[PDB]
């Protein structure tokens, strides 16, 4: 059981440290002290030896008792990590006698005033015998790295202290939470089917929720464990609210009655806008596409998918920096215009839309169908929140976070949304050029500035019925008799917008 205040009270340190479940209980084959005044450098080491023995025989026992394809290798290193942690910590640790004595008695039993570079070799000494205590053991009796004739792990190098505590904290912290949502999970899996009523299966969601607030009680106690750290540190998500919030699968019955994770994208670095289109219009962006044909990887896609994906990454990242640099300043046409180029990097990996090389890169990667795109899918969900999470390194690095639900609407719909609201600031922009202009000013025209300057917008109209001719060959994708139409096309494009449409279809 996690008892928290058990562990406090004994510690007397304040310290946030909670010893997993199974790591905490006992075995009590084991006896404190034994003899009382038979101590001896040599009875000392026998002792230590047999207590080391036997801690190895309660740790297969137990992993016997578990039994598991990988939960067994996964407890004989943390088993290992923490026998390291006790008997090379020449610190202060938990423990009233069992170090400081024993360490005591040796350095005044060895030598007047012995060194600890003595006590140090000991130690590695204890820690090969303890590598070496399996005796040669058979195959069979022990489960190790499989090897002909011989089923045994490599020894492991021992890392900074500090380091290898942070690591044994961070796996028992991340296995507790998989063991956790796995519990969830496994029960009131289904939740679709009769899922209408709460009442039915309410009490998984309870078992979640209590889940949730010990998910909470973890997280603080985390932070402070952390702050412990920061002390003696002395020489699928989208950010740790994850860890708080529960899966959206549970959302469904559910429903309402410091920066080394950001350095990665500095690890792994390395006139369009302007343009004045002159039947199918082209895209700024999309006409300028880094979707470059290279045939001297189409192999290696074959061969290793690995080449593959850090080319895929690699093209991503070079674009994303372009599009940044290219956009300007202005944060909100910027956040526009990155939603526009989002929309279009979706729409064309999807293998949905006009182009010739993206089908033709699409069909040599995986040979995509026509419109299944499931995985295609989740890779671009993927590579969109990575994107995200790039871009919001960049905005914080530059000047000193979730994903907005109005871009997560379908491609497609956005992207005839996008062109409706890029057309809206167009409009506007014009409008408010021509009224600066030569408003106030009043035969011969005497000002030759704004004799082309209402006619462009006329001519800019006429351009709106292309797009509308467009617009109506989208209609005809639209009219189409499977989902012709869920709710009416101007009301729908008045609704489509969270008081963005105002201007639209107006």
């Given at each position: ?7 406090r009270?004994p510690?007397?340190?304040?310290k946030?440290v909670?010893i997993?479940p ?5 075995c ?7 003899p009382?005044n038979?101590?001896n450098?040599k009875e000392f080491?026998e002792?230590?030896?047999k207590?080391?023995?036997s801690?190895?025989?309660f ?7 578990d039994?598991?394809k990988?939960?067994a290798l996964?407890?004989m290193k ?11 910590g020449?610190?202060m640790?938990t423990?009233?006698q069992?170090?400081d004595?024993?360490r ?5 039993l060895e030598?007047e005033?012995n060194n600890?570079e003595?006590?140090d070799?000991?130690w590695?000494?204890n820690?090969k015998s303890?590598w070496?205590?399996?005796?040669c053991?058979y195959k069979k009796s ?8 011989w089923?045994?792990?490599p020894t ?8 290898r505590?942070?690591?044994?904290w961070?796996?028992n ?6 063991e956790?949502?796995?519990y969830v999970?496994?029960?009131?899996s289904n939740?679709?089917?009769l899922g209408?009523?709460?009442?039915e299966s309410?009490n998984?969601?309870s078992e ?10 973890r997280?603080i106690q985390?932070?402070?464990?952390s702050?412990?750290?920061?002390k003696?540190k002395g020489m ?8 708080k919030?529960?899966?959206e699968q ?6 309402l009655?410091?920066?080394y ?12 806008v ?5 039947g199918?219009?082209?895209?700024p962006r ?10 001297s990887?189409?192999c290696?896609?074959?061969?290793d998918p690995k080449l ?7 093209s991503?990242?070079s674009?994303v920096?372009?599009?940044k ?5 202005a ?7 990155m939603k526009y ?7 064309i ?5 006009m182009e ?6 699409i069909?040599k990667?995986?040979?995509d ?10 890779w671009?969900?993927m ?11 960049g905005?914080k690095?530059?000047?000193?976070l ?6 997560d609407?379908?491609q497609?719909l956005?992207?005839f949304?996008?062109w409706?609201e ?5 409009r506007?922009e014009?409008?408010?050029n021509?009224?600066?202009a030569?408003?106030?000013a ?12 209402c006619?462009?917008?006329?001519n800019f109209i006429?351009?709106?019925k292309?797009?509308y001719?467009?617009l109506?060959?989208?209609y005809?994708?639209?009219?189409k008799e499977t ?16 008081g963005e449409?105002?201007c639209?279809?107006?």
């Open positions: 059981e996690w008892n928290d205040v058990d562990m009270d510690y007397n340190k304040y946030g909670l997993p199974r790591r905490r209980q006992l009590f084959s084991r006896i404190v002290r034994g009382a038979l101590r450098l080491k002792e230590i030896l207590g080391a023995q801690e190895g025989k740790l297969g026992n137990y992993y016997n008792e039994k598991d990988e939960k996964e407890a943390n088993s290992f990590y923490d026998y390291e942690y006790i008997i090379k020449s610190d640790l423990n009233i069992f170090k004595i024993k005591k008695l040796d350095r005044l030598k005033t600890t003595k006590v070799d000991w590695e000494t820690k303890i070496n205590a399996m005796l053991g022990g489960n190790k790295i499989i090897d002909p004739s089923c045994t792990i492991t190098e021992t890392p900074p202290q500090f380091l505590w942070i690591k044994e961070g796996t912290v991340c296995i507790q939470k998989e956790h949502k796995e999970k496994s029960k009131c939740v679709t089917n209408a009523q709460e009442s309410k998984c969601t979640i929720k209590k889940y949730q607030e010990w998910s909470r009680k997280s985390w932070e402070a464990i702050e412990g750290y920061k003696y699928t998500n989208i950010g740790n609210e994850a860890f919030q529960i899966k549970v959302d469904i019955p559910a429903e009655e410091n920066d994770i950001c350095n990665k994208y500095k690890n792994i670095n390395v006139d369009l302007k343009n004045s289109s002159d199918v219009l082209l895209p999309r006409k300028n596409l880094f979707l470059k044909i290279d045939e990887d189409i290696k896609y074959k061969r593959f994906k850090d080319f895929i990454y690699s991503a990242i674009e920096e372009r599009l640099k290219v956009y300007g300043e944060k909100t046409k910027v956040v526009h215009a180029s989002f929309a279009d990097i979706g729409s990996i999807k293998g949905d839309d010739n090389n993206s089908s033709d890169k069909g990667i995986l040979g169908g026509v419109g299944q795109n499931e995985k295609r899918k989740k671009w969900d590579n969109k929140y990575h994107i995200w999470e790039s871009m919001l390194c905005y690095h530059a000047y000193g979730d994903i907005p639900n109005n871009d609407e379908h497609f956005r992207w949304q996008e409706t890029n057309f809206c600031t167009k506007n014009l409008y408010e021509m009224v600066t030569c408003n106030s009043k035969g011969s025209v005497d000002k030759k500035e704004c004799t082309e300057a006619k462009n917008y006329s006429l351009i709106k292309k797009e001719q467009s109506n060959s989208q005809d994708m639209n009219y989902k012709a139409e869920k709710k009416e096309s101007p009301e729908y494009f008045k609704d489509k917008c969270n449409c105002s639209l279809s107006e």
